[PDB]
Paper text:
We previously identified a circular bacteriocin plantacyclin B21AG from Lactiplantibacillus plantarum B21 (previously known as Lactobacillus plantarum). This family II circular bacteriocin has antimicrobial activity against foodborne pathogens including Listeria monocytogenes and Clostridium perfringens and other closely related Lactobacillus species. Of these, circular bacteriocins (class I) have gained attention due to their unique characteristics of high thermal and pH stability, as well as resistance to degradation by many proteolytic enzymes. The covalently linked N- and C-termini form a structurally distinct cyclic peptide backbone.
A crystal from these conditions diffracted to 1.8 Å resolution and belonged to the space group C2221. The crystal structure diffraction data were phased by molecular replacement using a theoretical α-helix (8 residues long polyalanine) as a search model. There are two independent molecules of plantacyclin B21AG in the asymmetric unit. The structures of these two molecules (Chain A and Chain B) are similar to each other, with a Cα backbone root-mean-square deviation, RMSD of 0.56 Å across 58 Cα atoms. The four α-helices in the crystal structure are connected by loops of 1 to 6 residues and enclose a hydrophobic core in a tightly folded globular arrangement. Helix α1 and helix α4 are linked covalently between Ile1 and Ala58 in the middle of helix α4, creating a circular backbone. The second, third and fourth α-helices are predominantly hydrophobic, with the linked amino acids at the N- and C-termini in helix α4 buried in the core of the structure. In contrast, helix α1 is amphipathic, with hydrophilic residues (Thr14, Gln18, Ser25 and Ser26) exposed at the surface of the protein.
Residue numbers in the entry: 1 to 58
Amino acid sequence: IVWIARQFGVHLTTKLTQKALDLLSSGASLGTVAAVILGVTLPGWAVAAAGALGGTAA
């Protein structure tokens, strides 16, 4: 989540992180979480690059 926020210009709050992590952990895809929570439509290469990290780092 941190890498996404950094690379795509999102102001990341602790609340946005908390929501994203729970949703990812429950089974929503990294792309959908990025779009819905972080407001960022990720290209394919960015979904892959972020997905290589642990969830908080992603």
